[PDB]
Amino acid sequence: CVADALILRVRSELSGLPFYWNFHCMLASPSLVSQHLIRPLMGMSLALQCQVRELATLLHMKDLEIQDYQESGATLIRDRLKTEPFEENSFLEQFMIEKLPEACSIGDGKPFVMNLQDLYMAVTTQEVQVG
Amino acid sequence: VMEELEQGLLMQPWAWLQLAENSLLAKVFITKQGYALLVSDLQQVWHEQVDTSVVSQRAKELNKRLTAPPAAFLCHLDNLLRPLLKDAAHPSEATFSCDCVADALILRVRSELSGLPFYWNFHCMLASPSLVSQHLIRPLMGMSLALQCQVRELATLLHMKDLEIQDYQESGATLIRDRLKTEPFEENSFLEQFMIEKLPEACSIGDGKPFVMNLQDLYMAVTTQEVQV
């Protein structure tokens, strides 16, 4: 890192013989960084929120199924499988108080590459298709 | 002073600004010693941090006769701006205009206090790479990771309820109403169907209104956690 530029040196063995390359990089313009990082990430966040809402709806439907089965006089063989009714606010509060610190740890970019790369590609493809 | 303004700007949530048939995303932190402002339009980001002396000078140049201390001027500016940022459709008179230069952006604010005019201008230059990074790139990644964790937890809960459904079906009972039956949950099929059908409409960010409307508590929590460490 010299001045505002970046020199990335790559050394390799092309059939056992030297292979040197030097990428000279200059700070990207605001448009490139924006369209590459900011908007896609917002799309991924919105998609994940929609997925969470759909999962909450499915959980509510399952809760209705449980309630109707209880009303039908049915008895479960094992009492340990009983699950508490799902409430969105309580679940969100518990998550935010307990597991947010570990979940939000960006670290050094490894979790982003490992976990969220299909959503990023899909959002980018949608953006390209739109225009 | 400057550190306090930077921390306040970092900890503030985004707001939607409707101005001259155009949209912007704004964060403002005003204290008696100065103010900080961050503006964006999903294409570029501008930042402006101003102290007391510049406040007094600009208030004099624009309002040629408004003889008030900088603290009162900043307090009035905050009182005028915060109601709009917190919620739209407020019954307040505050018109916003935007002008563009090679690199600068001029945000003109006009309003009335007790029926008399009140003008202000923000000269927002392009923000440095560090500010835009720390304000958008990292918090958004944290929000995405947290949302994925929430999705995984919800999937686990759905699996547990599916186990309960299987147990109750094995018990041999039947529902009084058959319309409530739901098929077993499979994560892969659900994800594939979501991607095929709902992703195009859900990933549409538009002019930024969905971001402020939906994701503003998770963003604040992620930023607060980042501030601590």
From Swiss-Prot, chain A:
It comes from the Eukaryota. Changing residue 18 to D: Does not affect ability to participate in V(D)J recombination. The keyword Amino-acid biosynthesis does not apply. It is found in: Nucleus; Chromosome. The coiled-coil region mediates homodimerization. The Leu-lock (Leu-17) site inserts into a hydrophobic pocket in XRCC4. Was named 'Cernunnos' after the enigmatic Celtic god of hunting, the underworld and fertility. This is Non-homologous end-joining factor 1. The chain holds residues 99 to 229 of 299 of the full protein.
